């Protein structure tokens, strides 16, 4: 868990302008969070990038999990191997509001983080999932009670988020 260059927002939330994949390779965290969908199909975005860094091992493991257990619920999670990125990967499904899912499920999604003492995570439901990223940071700060290190791979958005938090 050798996180470097993060800015501490609250006693348990830290943030950095960084690619979560590069962070996971350098830090070797106990847990890395994937921004998953309910069938664990890592087709693009954060999930595709994490799977590619495992050379597709994450996708094969995910398909076997879904065969035995069925899909996740929106707001839910499962723990699978971290492969070369972490000890464990926490696959968390935030709502996709561009596909009509309820933004109130973002609180449920972040509540999954509280079962793990330390996590490297992306900003849930941001990007093409369509949630307002400033709102997602506020739900993270108000919900997560364990130690979360957020990697946001866009300097423009990182600056907006920090300036929103410090108002
Ligand atoms: C807001 C945005 C800046 C942020 N992106 C990221 N945040 C942190 N580490 C990242 N690595 C990469 C990366 C690394 N390689 N490649 C080819 C990619 C891609 N794509 C992207 C990325 C973000 C946060 C949450 C979500 C998404 C995007 S989404 O659009 O994938 C939908 C799911 C929820």
Swiss-Prot record:
<comment type="function">
    <text>Responsible for the cleavages located at the N-terminus of the replicase polyprotein. Participates together with nsp4 in the assembly of virally-induced cytoplasmic double-membrane vesicles necessary for viral replication. Antagonizes innate immune induction of type I interferon by blocking the phosphorylation, dimerization and subsequent nuclear translocation of host IRF3. Also prevents host NF-kappa-B signaling. In addition, PL-PRO possesses a deubiquitinating/deISGylating activity and processes both 'Lys-48'- and 'Lys-63'-linked polyubiquitin chains from cellular substrates.</text>
</comment>
<protein>
    <recommendedName>
        <fullName>Papain-like protease nsp3</fullName>
    </recommendedName>
</protein>
<comment type="subunit">
    <text>May form homohexamers. Interacts with N protein.</text>
</comment>
<feature type="domain" description="Macro 1">
    <location>
        <begin position="1"/>
        <end position="167"/>
    </location>
</feature>
């Amino acid at each position: 868990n050798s996180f470097s260059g993060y800015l501490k927002l609250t006693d348990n939330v830290y943030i950095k302008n960084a690619d979560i994949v590069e962070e996971a390779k350098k830090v070797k965290p106990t847990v890395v969070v994937n921004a998953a969908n309910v069938y664990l199909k890592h087709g693009g975005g954060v999930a595709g990038a994490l799977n590619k860094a495992t050379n597709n091992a994450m996708q094969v493991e995910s398909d076997d999990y879904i065969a035995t257990n069925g899909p996740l619920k929106v707001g839910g999670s499962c723990v699978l191997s971290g492969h070369n990125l972490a000890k464990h990967c926490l696959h968390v499904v935030g709502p996709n509001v561009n596909k009509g899912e309820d933004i109130q499920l973002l609180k449920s999604a972040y509540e999954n983080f509280n079962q793990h003492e330390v996590l490297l995570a992306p900003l849930l439901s941001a990007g093409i999932f369509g949630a307002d990223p400033i709102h997602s940071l506020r739900v993270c700060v108000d919900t997560v009670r364990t130690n979360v290190y957020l990697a946001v791979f866009d300097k423009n958005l990182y600056d907006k988020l920090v300036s929103s938090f410090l108002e």
